[PDB]
Amino acid sequence: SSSVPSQKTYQGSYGFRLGFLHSGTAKFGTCTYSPALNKMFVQLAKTVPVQLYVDSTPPPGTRVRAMAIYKQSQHMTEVVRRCPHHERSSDSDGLAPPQHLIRVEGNLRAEYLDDPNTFRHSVVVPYEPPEVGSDYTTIYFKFMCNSSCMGGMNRRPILVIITLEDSSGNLLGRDSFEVRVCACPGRDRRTEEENLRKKTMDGEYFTLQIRGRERFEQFRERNEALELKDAQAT
Amino acid sequence: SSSVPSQKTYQGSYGFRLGFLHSGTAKFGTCTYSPALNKMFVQLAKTVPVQLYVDSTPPPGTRVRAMAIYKQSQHMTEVVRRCPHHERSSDSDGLAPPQHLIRVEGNLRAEYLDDPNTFRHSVVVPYEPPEVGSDYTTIYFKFMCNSSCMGGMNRRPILVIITLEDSSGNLLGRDSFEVRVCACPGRDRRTEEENLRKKTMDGEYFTLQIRGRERFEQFRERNEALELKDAQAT
Amino acid sequence: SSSVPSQKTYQGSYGFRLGFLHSGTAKFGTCTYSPALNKMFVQLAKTVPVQLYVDSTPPPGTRVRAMAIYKQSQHMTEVVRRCPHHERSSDSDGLAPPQHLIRVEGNLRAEYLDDPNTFRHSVVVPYEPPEVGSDYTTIYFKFMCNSSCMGGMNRRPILVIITLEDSSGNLLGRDSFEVRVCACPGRDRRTEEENLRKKTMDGEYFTLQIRGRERFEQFRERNEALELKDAQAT
Amino acid sequence: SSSVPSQKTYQGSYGFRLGFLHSGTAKFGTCTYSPALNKMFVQLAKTVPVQLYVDSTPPPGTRVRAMAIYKQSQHMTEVVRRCPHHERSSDSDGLAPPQHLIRVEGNLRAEYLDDPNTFRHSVVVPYEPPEVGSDYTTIYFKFMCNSSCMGGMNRRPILVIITLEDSSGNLLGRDSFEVRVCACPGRDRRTEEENLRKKTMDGEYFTLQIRGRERFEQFRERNEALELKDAQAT
DNA sequence: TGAGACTTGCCCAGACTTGCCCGTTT
DNA sequence: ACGGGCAAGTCTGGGCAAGTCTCAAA
Ligand SMILES: [Zn+2]
Ligand SMILES: [Zn+2]
Ligand SMILES: [Zn+2]
Ligand SMILES: [Zn+2]
């Protein structure tokens, strides 16, 4: 039990936001991103490239923090950590504590915090400008546990919160995306995108006894507008 | 020995009311809320989130009171406790009295009051201002005792009054909503919303073709919301 | 967790065994017995007459003990007691401890034991000869909890072990019968006897490949034996 | 490779051997034994009864010890213990070390040993004679892990060894059986006997028709049991 | 190295269970 | 005093979930 950190998108004064467009080779050979679900599908310990976008350059000392929380409300108050099994392993490069789920790769300037009040785990790195020629900064993450790990996430969906903060920790920007660490990213992505499709492309009409004339016309109208936009695979 | 607290629709000075995240009606769905009923169906021990909305932020310290008492008048003056089976059953938290129905997990500034004289269990938390970007406040409850339990609510309906206090605990806000804790929120929600519509179905009601199952739930999530106003001022 | 007491029928040197043939009025107005299931169906706290049969008269000091254990193997090691709710009640005539499920009625010579090693509950009464004219002794029992009581038996089927022991406690005879304490004995009995019928009204066939002439002979003969018993009662 | 406990069946001077109960191939059947494979299919932490048969009463102070080892030769030298997850969890039982895989229910005289040399785990209990009227004594075990727990048995098959030792620890008897702790005993069993049933099937087989699914499976059991004795006895 | 073909843990909707009220029966 | 019609809790097995094995084709 611990207070739940906000997950509301907030572009802030710098128009902070994330992107997931990276070469499908040597970087995406494992993981795949679903725009429709805003969910990343990656294997255990495999690198996940995330792009940081910002309109103007942040003040000196700005950092980028990554944190994980459970998506479902009945679990939002439970800290996200590694399972007993994976926790005890040499997989730790020394820098990252064995109990942290999220790891930053390719950056020795990373810093892992184990909040003394919320007991929440997070990893932080100094904000760095985009490479000349590009308009985004790249950050490489690694997830050290399967979403299914018993004792750990235990088949519970998680959400990664990326926050842009000043030297003092004050919020400057915040974005997020769902994550499922599994053994078959490609497969699982199809299944989920397929289930999403059905929930959308459903052909079972229904009825409702609306009241009044105006309110009646509201739905009746806003409905003919949507029932028209259905023309997508036409 | 004492009396029962009121529950008049008291918005307040700013604009204090409660909101509930729309839940998809199922069978064993952990939790769901009925708009046209103002009733919250939910299994026990399963965290339930309740939204806090308000215009201008009240004066610092102004806490938010949450209490629950039997719906019907016949037992309205009876203390709401748990069954002897659940009494023994200890909880992860000791900061919350065992014979307590309502709870507030993920918080530390929450007070699980226990009024001896009036004999009315309750709980209060310091109204937290909406996070930078966040448009409202959230609080998590965990009703620790079913309604059908023998030796407790014993099938007897309940209710939960969320009132806004102040430095001492006077008046500044008021809200309410029925709370039936069971093992089938979805199943029970149909049998009730349906049995409701089986009452006075005549008048201005015209048929309206609605495609899509989910989209069908959407059109009702609003038609009923507006239909509430047709009762709000009754 | 406690060692499981034997439940194997043992007529012993006295041909000890039970019978359940009692007037359907003032004695069976509540409970009913199923020969096909060897299961008694009785309401909470209602008297249940059981007949003790014996070929020759037992030595001086013989007693009759009644004990309850769970029928299903996964529960056999758990002591059978009353639920928290019913446990706390004036229903106790003083003689019988509030935690005992089984009670002997109409006999102030009864004695309730709460085993110091197995923690098992039981009630004992001195063996008494049959009434002149009859060839059986009657004993009246009372069950203080529904089979469904949560915290108690919790919908788990139980089995009552009646043992005939000498003054020292040594086993002389043992018999048993299943018991379901419910609110509608008649109803429940029909349902269960009806389900039993279907299971035996099964008329699907299967072929078996037996290896070895003498084996087939033995297997065949056995199957015929059952084939006949199928005609014996149709 | 330094020390592996024998698994050679040895009836000994007292004709020691085990027996089990007849279970149905349910879906989530708590426990079920397969005479065809001499393997027990049981759910995590659910009671498993094992019948102890003896031709003659063993000397005073005789004990029974259960120990688990891996069945596959390449793992025989690896101690069988609980996995990191389940290990870090104190169950209602406090007599058994948290790392031991096998536990004994309802017996406060059980003693758990951690061998100082072999480092193997084992639980021991006093041998008790059969209760008057019975032909065997019975022990109730519990397996605190799934055959598939990662960091534990890791989908590796285990063999449970029951030895009958004298007051000095000398061998008096030994029998054994395979164990699979899983979520669906019935299912997993039906599958194994299946693949087994489609193997070695040559010779002259007499055919016999049986009516009713229950009857058939009883016959099929006994027959599959004899086909096991035939095999190993050349 | 990409995905069928397993292996193996769990969800979950349609029963099924079961205490209780109620009007009618003997 | 026995069924019928509810109120709720829980069981059940088909289906889905999700890691691992393996074999042929880049
Ligand atoms: Zn893990
Ligand atoms: Zn309760
Ligand atoms: Zn009870
Ligand atoms: Zn385990």
Tab-separated table of N, CA, C and O in Angstrom, chain B residues 73-119:
chain	number	residue	atom	x	y	z
B	73	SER	N	-35.077	2.468	7.208
B	73	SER	CA	-35.259	3.153	8.481
B	73	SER	C	-35.355	2.200	9.671
B	73	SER	O	-34.984	2.562	10.789
B	74	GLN	N	-35.843	0.985	9.429
B	74	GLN	CA	-36.011	-0.014	10.486
B	74	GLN	C	-34.742	-0.339	11.268
B	74	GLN	O	-34.803	-0.619	12.466
B	75	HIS	N	-33.593	-0.311	10.598
B	75	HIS	CA	-32.330	-0.609	11.271
B	75	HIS	C	-31.371	0.576	11.191
B	75	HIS	O	-30.222	0.477	11.628
B	76	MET	N	-31.853	1.693	10.646
B	76	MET	CA	-31.043	2.898	10.465
B	76	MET	C	-30.162	3.305	11.657
B	76	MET	O	-29.106	3.923	11.476
B	77	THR	N	-30.581	2.949	12.867
B	77	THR	CA	-29.821	3.309	14.064
B	77	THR	C	-28.887	2.211	14.566
B	77	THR	O	-28.421	2.254	15.707
B	78	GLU	N	-28.607	1.233	13.711
B	78	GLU	CA	-27.726	0.131	14.085
B	78	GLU	C	-26.306	0.339	13.541
B	78	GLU	O	-26.125	0.796	12.406
B	79	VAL	N	-25.304	0.014	14.356
B	79	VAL	CA	-23.903	0.159	13.956
B	79	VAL	C	-23.564	-0.794	12.811
B	79	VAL	O	-23.978	-1.956	12.821
B	80	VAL	N	-22.814	-0.302	11.827
B	80	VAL	CA	-22.430	-1.126	10.682
B	80	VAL	C	-21.066	-1.759	10.930
B	80	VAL	O	-20.036	-1.103	10.791
B	81	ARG	N	-21.075	-3.039	11.300
B	81	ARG	CA	-19.855	-3.784	11.601
B	81	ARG	C	-19.739	-4.984	10.671
B	81	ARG	O	-20.557	-5.159	9.766
B	82	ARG	N	-18.727	-5.812	10.900
B	82	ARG	CA	-18.526	-7.002	10.085
B	82	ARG	C	-19.042	-8.215	10.849
B	82	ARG	O	-19.408	-8.111	12.018
B	83	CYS	N	-19.072	-9.366	10.186
B	83	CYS	CA	-19.543	-10.593	10.818
B	83	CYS	C	-18.478	-11.208	11.739
B	83	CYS	O	-17.296	-10.873	11.656
B	84	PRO	N	-18.892	-12.116	12.638
B	84	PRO	CA	-17.942	-12.758	13.553
B	84	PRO	C	-16.863	-13.534	12.799
B	84	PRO	O	-15.756	-13.712	13.298
B	85	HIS	N	-17.196	-13.995	11.597
B	85	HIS	CA	-16.257	-14.746	10.771
B	85	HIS	C	-15.174	-13.814	10.244
B	85	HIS	O	-13.996	-14.175	10.184
B	86	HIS	N	-15.590	-12.613	9.858
B	86	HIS	CA	-14.679	-11.608	9.325
B	86	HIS	C	-13.963	-10.818	10.418
B	86	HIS	O	-12.871	-10.295	10.191
B	87	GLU	N	-14.574	-10.737	11.599
B	87	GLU	CA	-13.961	-10.027	12.719
B	87	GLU	C	-12.577	-10.598	12.966
B	87	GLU	O	-11.579	-9.882	12.888
B	88	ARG	N	-12.529	-11.895	13.266
B	88	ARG	CA	-11.267	-12.584	13.524
B	88	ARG	C	-10.267	-12.333	12.394
B	88	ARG	O	-9.140	-11.880	12.633
B	89	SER	N	-10.692	-12.627	11.167
B	89	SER	CA	-9.853	-12.446	9.987
B	89	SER	C	-9.117	-11.111	9.997
B	89	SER	O	-9.676	-10.074	9.621
B	90	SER	N	-7.860	-11.146	10.429
B	90	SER	CA	-7.025	-9.949	10.486
B	90	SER	C	-6.724	-9.411	9.086
B	90	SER	O	-6.838	-10.130	8.086
B	91	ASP	N	-6.339	-8.137	9.030
B	91	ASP	CA	-6.020	-7.469	7.772
B	91	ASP	C	-4.562	-7.024	7.756
B	91	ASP	O	-3.922	-6.910	8.806
B	92	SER	N	-4.047	-6.780	6.554
B	92	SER	CA	-2.669	-6.335	6.366
B	92	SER	C	-2.406	-5.064	7.171
B	92	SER	O	-1.298	-4.842	7.673
B	93	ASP	N	-3.439	-4.235	7.292
B	93	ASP	CA	-3.332	-2.981	8.022
B	93	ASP	C	-3.942	-3.053	9.414
B	93	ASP	O	-4.996	-3.657	9.621
B	94	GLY	N	-3.260	-2.425	10.368
B	94	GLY	CA	-3.746	-2.391	11.733
B	94	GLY	C	-4.263	-1.000	12.045
B	94	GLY	O	-4.934	-0.782	13.058
B	95	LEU	N	-3.946	-0.057	11.158
B	95	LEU	CA	-4.361	1.334	11.311
B	95	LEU	C	-5.863	1.442	11.072
B	95	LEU	O	-6.479	2.475	11.344
B	96	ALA	N	-6.448	0.359	10.571
B	96	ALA	CA	-7.878	0.317	10.308
B	96	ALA	C	-8.523	-0.725	11.219
B	96	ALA	O	-8.142	-1.899	11.198
B	97	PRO	N	-9.501	-0.300	12.045
B	97	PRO	CA	-10.212	-1.187	12.975
B	97	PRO	C	-10.836	-2.382	12.259
B	97	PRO	O	-11.440	-2.232	11.197
B	98	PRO	N	-10.706	-3.586	12.839
B	98	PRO	CA	-11.271	-4.794	12.230
B	98	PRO	C	-12.783	-4.709	11.983
B	98	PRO	O	-13.263	-5.067	10.907
B	99	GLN	N	-13.531	-4.225	12.968
B	99	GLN	CA	-14.978	-4.111	12.823
B	99	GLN	C	-15.357	-2.890	11.986
B	99	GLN	O	-16.379	-2.242	12.229
B	100	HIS	N	-14.531	-2.575	10.995
B	100	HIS	CA	-14.799	-1.430	10.133
B	100	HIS	C	-15.159	-1.868	8.719
B	100	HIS	O	-14.465	-2.689	8.113
B	101	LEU	N	-16.254	-1.318	8.204
B	101	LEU	CA	-16.725	-1.654	6.864
B	101	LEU	C	-15.958	-0.879	5.797
B	101	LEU	O	-15.351	-1.470	4.898
B	102	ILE	N	-15.994	0.445	5.907
B	102	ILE	CA	-15.308	1.313	4.964
B	102	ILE	C	-13.817	1.435	5.279
B	102	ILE	O	-13.389	1.280	6.426
B	103	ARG	N	-13.030	1.695	4.241
B	103	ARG	CA	-11.588	1.860	4.370
B	103	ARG	C	-11.049	2.841	3.333
B	103	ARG	O	-11.769	3.297	2.443
B	104	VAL	N	-9.770	3.163	3.465
B	104	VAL	CA	-9.100	4.080	2.557
B	104	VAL	C	-7.646	3.643	2.479
B	104	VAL	O	-6.824	4.038	3.309
B	105	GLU	N	-7.341	2.820	1.478
B	105	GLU	CA	-5.992	2.300	1.294
B	105	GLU	C	-5.151	3.195	0.399
B	105	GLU	O	-5.683	3.975	-0.395
B	106	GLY	N	-3.834	3.077	0.540
B	106	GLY	CA	-2.922	3.874	-0.262
B	106	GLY	C	-2.716	5.265	0.298
B	106	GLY	O	-2.054	6.104	-0.319
B	107	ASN	N	-3.291	5.509	1.474
B	107	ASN	CA	-3.169	6.807	2.129
B	107	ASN	C	-2.581	6.644	3.532
B	107	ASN	O	-2.570	5.543	4.086
B	108	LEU	N	-2.080	7.741	4.093
B	108	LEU	CA	-1.492	7.722	5.430
B	108	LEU	C	-2.075	8.828	6.309
B	108	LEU	O	-2.012	8.749	7.536
B	109	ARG	N	-2.635	9.856	5.673
B	109	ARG	CA	-3.246	10.976	6.386
B	109	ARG	C	-4.739	10.749	6.583
B	109	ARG	O	-5.481	11.672	6.922
B	110	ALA	N	-5.169	9.511	6.368
B	110	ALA	CA	-6.568	9.150	6.522
B	110	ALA	C	-6.857	8.735	7.965
B	110	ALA	O	-6.083	7.996	8.579
B	111	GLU	N	-7.974	9.217	8.503
B	111	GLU	CA	-8.360	8.888	9.869
B	111	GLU	C	-9.588	7.989	9.904
B	111	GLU	O	-10.653	8.359	9.411
B	112	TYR	N	-9.428	6.804	10.484
B	112	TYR	CA	-10.531	5.859	10.611
B	112	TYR	C	-11.241	6.095	11.941
B	112	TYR	O	-11.162	5.267	12.855
B	113	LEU	N	-11.929	7.233	12.036
B	113	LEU	CA	-12.662	7.606	13.245
B	113	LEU	C	-13.520	6.485	13.831
B	113	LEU	O	-13.801	5.473	13.177
B	114	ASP	N	-13.924	6.686	15.080
B	114	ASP	CA	-14.741	5.719	15.798
B	114	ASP	C	-15.441	6.458	16.940
B	114	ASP	O	-14.940	6.516	18.070
B	115	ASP	N	-16.596	7.036	16.624
B	115	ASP	CA	-17.382	7.795	17.592
B	115	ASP	C	-18.107	6.865	18.567
B	115	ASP	O	-18.993	6.104	18.177
B	116	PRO	N	-17.731	6.920	19.854
B	116	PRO	CA	-18.341	6.084	20.892
B	116	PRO	C	-19.791	6.462	21.211
B	116	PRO	O	-20.701	5.636	21.104
B	117	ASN	N	-19.990	7.719	21.601
B	117	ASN	CA	-21.311	8.234	21.958
B	117	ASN	C	-22.368	7.922	20.899
B	117	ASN	O	-23.329	7.195	21.164
B	118	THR	N	-22.180	8.472	19.702
B	118	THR	CA	-23.121	8.272	18.606
B	118	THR	C	-23.022	6.863	18.049
B	118	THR	O	-23.964	6.366	17.433
B	119	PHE	N	-21.880	6.223	18.274
B	119	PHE	CA	-21.649	4.868	17.781
B	119	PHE	C	-21.728	4.811	16.254
B	119	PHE	O	-22.399	3.944	15.683
